[PDB]
């Protein structure tokens, strides 16, 4: 067992498209080191195990330059286990993950929001390490959303089989132990 502490990093990028602004040339800003639009970037912290790892990871909203309106809440445990995939560089890990995310909106009086969503997954990837100083995380994140009971039941027939309703993340980041 060890504590460990860093950050994650999830890209979250469906659809693959580009654009361009203004084809004239004419306005040309000064910003050249960090320029995204959708991803999702929190802190690390949890305790490491002989036979597995825990590690939380807290967040609160992508940043962007047309963010209207942005707060709330975001904490996650997720437990996996790792173990050397190769060599002693990469940890391939495995695991599930559940928190709560709390979200908030302008109403005032009559409150539409519960602030009250369960969160559940799973985990799985691979953390590069390079010496006694930190580490590095990278591979795939599944979570799921506030799903209990439903509202108006349709019901229809089982044609034979489908993958259930999963949401597709990535994980890149680094680990820090203590």
């Not at 040309?28 to 959708?38: A, E, F, G, M, R």
């Not at 597995?52 to 445990?77: V, W």
Request: charged share 20%.
């Amino acid at each position: 067992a060890d504590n460990f502490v860093g950050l994650t990093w999830g890209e979250t990028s469906n659809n693959i498209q580009k654009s361009k602004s203004l084809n004239r040339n004419l306005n040309s800003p000064n910003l050249d080191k960090v320029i995204d639009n959708t991803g999702t970037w929190g802190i690390r912290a949890g305790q490491q195990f002989e036979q597995g790892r825990y590690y939380a990871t807290y967040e609160n909203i992508s940043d962007t330059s047309s963010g209207n309106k942005l707060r709330q809440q975001n904490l996650l445990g997720s437990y996996d286990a790792f173990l050397p995939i190769g060599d002693n560089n990469t940890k391939l890990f495995g695991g599930a993950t559940l928190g709560l995310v709390k979200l908030e909106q302008d109403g005032k009086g009559f409150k539409r929001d519960s602030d009250v969503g369960y969160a559940a997954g799973l985990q799985a990837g691979i953390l590069q390490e390079l010496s006694k100083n930190a580490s590095i995380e990278g591979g795939y994140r599944y979570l799921r959303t506030n799903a209990s009971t439903e509202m108006t039941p349709h019901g229809g027939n089982k044609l034979g089989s489908l993958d259930l309703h999963s949401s597709s993340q990535f994980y890149l980041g680094a680990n820090y132990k203590f």
